[PDB]
Design an enzyme around this catalytic site. Structure first.
Site, PDB file in Angstrom:
ATOM      1  N   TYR A  70       0.831  -1.204   0.000  1.00  0.00           N
ATOM      2  CA  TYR A  70       0.000   0.000   0.000  1.00  0.00           C
ATOM      3  C   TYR A  70       0.866   1.254   0.000  1.00  0.00           C
ATOM      4  CZ  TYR A  70      -3.405  -3.489   1.847  1.00  0.00           C
ATOM      5  OH  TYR A  70      -4.185  -4.665   2.066  1.00  0.00           O
ATOM      6  N   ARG A  93     -27.004 -10.348   5.395  1.00  0.00           N
ATOM      7  CA  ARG A  93     -27.211 -11.072   6.639  1.00  0.00           C
ATOM      8  C   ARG A  93     -27.115 -10.064   7.758  1.00  0.00           C
ATOM      9  NH1 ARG A  93     -23.947 -16.835   7.168  1.00  0.00           N
ATOM     10  NH2 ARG A  93     -25.767 -18.166   7.102  1.00  0.00           N
ATOM     11  N   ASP A 153     -26.741  -9.515 -11.122  1.00  0.00           N
ATOM     12  CA  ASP A 153     -28.052 -10.138 -11.031  1.00  0.00           C
ATOM     13  C   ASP A 153     -28.909  -9.787 -12.239  1.00  0.00           C
ATOM     14  OD1 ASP A 153     -26.790 -10.140  -8.365  1.00  0.00           O
ATOM     15  OD2 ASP A 153     -28.350 -11.613  -8.131  1.00  0.00           O
ATOM     16  N   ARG A 156     -27.637 -11.987 -15.386  1.00  0.00           N
ATOM     17  CA  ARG A 156     -28.239 -13.307 -15.290  1.00  0.00           C
ATOM     18  C   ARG A 156     -29.635 -13.290 -15.869  1.00  0.00           C
ATOM     19  NH1 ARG A 156     -26.305 -14.873  -9.642  1.00  0.00           N
ATOM     20  NH2 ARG A 156     -24.046 -14.935  -9.950  1.00  0.00           N
ATOM     21  N   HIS A 173     -33.081  -6.076 -22.692  1.00  0.00           N
ATOM     22  CA  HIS A 173     -32.998  -5.204 -21.525  1.00  0.00           C
ATOM     23  C   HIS A 173     -33.987  -5.591 -20.435  1.00  0.00           C
ATOM     24  CE1 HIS A 173     -32.084  -2.931 -25.350  1.00  0.00           C
ATOM     25  NE2 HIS A 173     -31.078  -2.329 -24.566  1.00  0.00           N
ATOM     26  N   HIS A 180     -28.725  -7.712  -3.397  1.00  0.00           N
ATOM     27  CA  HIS A 180     -28.046  -8.890  -3.918  1.00  0.00           C
ATOM     28  C   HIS A 180     -28.552 -10.164  -3.256  1.00  0.00           C
ATOM     29  CE1 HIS A 180     -23.909 -10.045  -5.935  1.00  0.00           C
ATOM     30  NE2 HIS A 180     -24.938 -10.983  -6.161  1.00  0.00           N
TER      31      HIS A 180
END
Ligand SMILES: O=P(O)(O)OC[C@H]1O[C@@](O)(COP(=O)(O)O)[C@@H](O)[C@@H]1O
Ligand SMILES: O=P(O)(O)OC[C@H]1O[C@@](O)(COP(=O)(O)O)[C@@H](O)[C@@H]1O
Lengths: 320, 320, 320, 320
Positions: A70, A93, A153, A156, A173, A180
């Protein structure tokens, strides 16, 4: 004009694990990088993945690939924190937002001190949560922290709306919004191939009361798990997305892409990160398109963006 | 030379909804971005669309894709406010210019404070209205605010002038001007394939008194609605345009494209945004080509550009 | 934003002879340059090679190509000293390092005074020797002086490990290390196609005691000479490599490539230039992967890197 | 499905001299060939140019490149007779059509007996004359004999109409017609950038009575000679054109390009080869666009196409 280091693009990968190694391979072939720096807490897998990737150059647009830390961390034009990732999977979660949030410090602070001045691009799950996280530590404004999410997503979704019919992807489209998994709602109300539209005028109306639809997003959002078998490798599809996305900001394409942005009442959900079709260029994102969600996809949104604001709130309590 | 963030391109997407997610996917594959930041008032859909897009990288030119806000918002080279969009459709209406104009503030102000210094690229309907909007708030000059518009009405037009004959697109020339629907007038007076020209010397004259023509722009401008069915997805065609457009400014191509510019008596319509074939490079637009509109396409223009100057005037009254 | 010269990439070619003219042609088609400046002590062959290359643009991504000197020499993003080359061939000889080292001054000093601030990319034989040379004059740090070497000996190697089997190049991995001819040792100990590996588990062990192997690098390193006949043109293979390499640094790809780097005890050979799979991005190289050479390829390395440290030492005695 | 030779494209080069070696290099990088066969009456320069080009593959889309004769001559999908060329330069002269016409037999007959069934693509000067030549021997129909010509005089033209203004090439339209030098007439009457047009409405009228124009095609057609100095290499610009042209037929693009076609009263010149903007796809050419030449470019055409019909007539008298 003299002594050198002709770059004028720079990208820093913060995970030479799976997703990263792939993001890398793509960035090498699609040719969108002018020097790539590869990190992750090892060093071995990185001198390896380099002396491979860098071999994989006489058949591609040249650069230099190393291994980082870094220090070699400024001069950058993008930073990709690609699976700076903990172990409890995804589906935003609760306590997940903890086991990261210190391996999101351990790597966000030193890419800042050197003199970062760009776009962060965190594709490190849970995403929506994370890019708010990556925001608050960085101090870096409401765009330079680009999220990710949605991209993988919709891609897919598209390619099931696809194979059903014949039409190529890149025609076809329709989006996905929210986060997510486990929240998502396809904006079917947009949904088109060829300027057409699926089921307002032609293919008729409802979802659950006909036999046909929906089923194929009950296996888009479930479509991760189903390859959290045969390897675990939900690792191509994504990396090939971090490339579209990454070529877009940096090539300055004033593009259109869904990616967890920052919401100012570009809905009414405000002050999470959740996301939508927004517009991204070199600097960062400039202008977030907002959608007549109908009356139902308004609800579905409203109850995604709520379920963060509880994982986003029970956790931004930094001191590890 | 040391510690890193090799970018030297940056793009910020402000809608990881439909258009944005797609702009993204393209920018990832066409390879025009060196770090992409994805926003929209969610965060979920953005950590998602990222951990997809960024997976979609070992088959493409590498970057980093995240989720943003507006801190990570400078370092940019482009900002794309891709459907920072309200709900009443398009056809530059009236009060539409209101329901945006606060979700155009909620997102234009913080991509400015961080230290924007680039091109805005607003493809967020109604466009023409909007980029004047995006101008007046930003303070940002008469080019760095690039509009959009026209692009996706010519691309259509072309590909009906196309399929009629055999000639590939990318050959086939002709524009559309004015705005975006309900005003438009095809510059048929230009209209060519192969250096030829349609109906001055060869295919004979008028429109309505012969049987043939016109019909196919009575379904170019209507060609949105006809896919505001089968999904709603007038979402590919556009995103693939924000990519051409975005590659052009940023790659520094001194290109030619129609996109709502700013009109100084580069007609006589002045001080709207409406648009025309102009020329765009890294900095912004430099020089706007103006067209002998004949005598009729002069009128048609003159009465587009009038119907804004009434939606543009009844609304630039900011204080939400 | 006003008065112009939209580049934001620059590359300077220092030999519009063979290798250079080709590097050029590629950089024109592969599309990795936004203004190219062409030098070599003539001017004729350069106004020629330009009014050709620049004609070769309506079928490619635009720029501007001229003829230089070293005033038009800053604004650069890369400098390529492509066969700034003397006449005794290659195989890092001894006194070769002399007949250059003044035509390496005659051209390194004035690309410095104007205000160089980039990466040098010297592919001008003998390479390893040279980039130490190009280093010491420039003052320019231990990366911005990128070498070359190895690239065009691995690409060969690959494509004999290739044609033997069926597998495409760009799959097929294995390197070459050391310098460039007469020293080289293939890292067979890595050597793979498809994740496999040649002769530890499957294809059995030794080299010379079986009949088969080795033979085909006794004609990789000899594979220059064998086209130092039919033209002399070991001129494509290389230029197409300076393009991979050049696209890599500049596009910021955090790539992987062998190229004579600078060795700090990234072995134990230190303070030559000899090379290895390293990682290159816009700025220069960042992190050099080091290899378990087994026990024999350790030796072979150790006695390459020794044979420089005698041609590198008998010559860095500058005052022509 | 078994035992192999996955090609399904084939291209045969009939001159691994200059133009050919370049056509080759391009076809290797632009990636338009799935096995390339290289001829010319030597064999040395071809085993050389192959073991270079074929080295230049780990950075490109794979194939196989050899050295031919005319046995390996069927299986083809294109044949390019690239400078199957004699020595008196170009400007469709008279007796030139002789010194070829036997080195056009010596190579047209045996690429026929094996079982050619494709498109010939003769870029071997004088072109117009030649492709009639290449027609009459082959028996091969009025399209499969594609010429060349015009392509490299328009590409030039474009890129002086260019640099004058700012607009990128690939925008900028205008042709050249007739042959190749000494006859040519720019179709200025078409001539546009951006849908505009040069000098009917805006830039005013005549050529010779104003000071400005014309001058820059008095150095497009003279622009060969001016690099029949600095090498002789009018060798890039062309090869990069035989690639556009070659990608077009074969990729099946239903494209638009000027190239010496066959004229049936697609003017009134008929039964030469001279050329014009025509349309080319896999099979060959399908449909030749014809142009309102005004009244003067009608003349200029008519007196090109006349000056062949005297070099075309004094020579098609075969028996060497
Ligand atoms: O479009 P292709 O077939 O590549 O033609 C390339 C050349 O053709 C042109 O004559 C113009 O063609 P278009 O106007 O149909 O695009 C010349 O300006 C270009 O360099
Ligand atoms: O050349 P770009 O800037 O990509 O424009 C693309 C569109 O522009 C056009 O309006 C024609 O532009 P040119 O005639 O200069 O090539 C439309 O036909 C294309 O789809």
């Amino acid at each position: 004009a003299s002594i050198t280091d002709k770059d004028h693009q720079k990208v820093i990968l913060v995970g030479d694990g799976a997703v990263g190694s792939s993001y890398a391979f793509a960035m090498v072939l699609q040719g969108i990088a002018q020097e790539i720096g590869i990190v992750d807490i090892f060093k071995d897998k990185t001198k390896g993945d380099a002396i491979d990737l860098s071999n994989a150059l006489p058949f591609t647009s040249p650069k230099k690939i190393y291994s980082a830390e870094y220090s070699d961390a400024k001069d950058a034009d993008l930073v990709v924190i690609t699976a700076g990732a903990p172990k409890q999977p995804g589906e935003t979660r609760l306590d997940l937002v903890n086991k990261n949030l210190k391996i999101l410090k351990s790597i966000v602070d030193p890419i800042v001190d050197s003199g970062f001045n760009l776009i962060f691009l965190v594709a490190a799950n849970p995403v929506d949560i994370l890019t708010y996280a990556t925001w608050k530590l960085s101090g870096f404004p409401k765009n330079r922290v680009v999220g990710s999410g949605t991209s993988l997503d919709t891609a897919r979704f598209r390619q099931s709306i696809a194979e059903m019919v014949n039409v190529d992807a890149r025609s076809v489209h329709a989006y996905i919004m929210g986060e997510h998994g486990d929240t998502e709602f396809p904006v079917w109300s947009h949904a088109n191939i060829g300027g057409v539209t699926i089921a307002e005028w032609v293919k008729a109306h409802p979802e659950i009361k006909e036999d046909k639809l929906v089923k194929m997003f009950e296996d888009v959002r479930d479509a991760a798990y189903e390859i959290i078998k045969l390897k675990g490798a939900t690792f191509y599809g994504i990396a090939t997305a971090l490339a579209r996305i990454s070529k877009a900001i940096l090539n300055d394409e004033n593009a259109v892409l869904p990616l967890s942005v920052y919401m100012d009442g570009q809905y009414g959900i405000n002050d999470l990160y959740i996301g939508t079709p927004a517009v991204i260029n070199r600097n960062g994102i400039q202008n977030i398109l907002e959608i007549p969600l109908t009356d139902h996809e308004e609800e579905s949104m409203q109850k995604s963006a709520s379920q963060l604001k509880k994982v986003l709130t029970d956790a931004f309590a930094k001191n590890d």
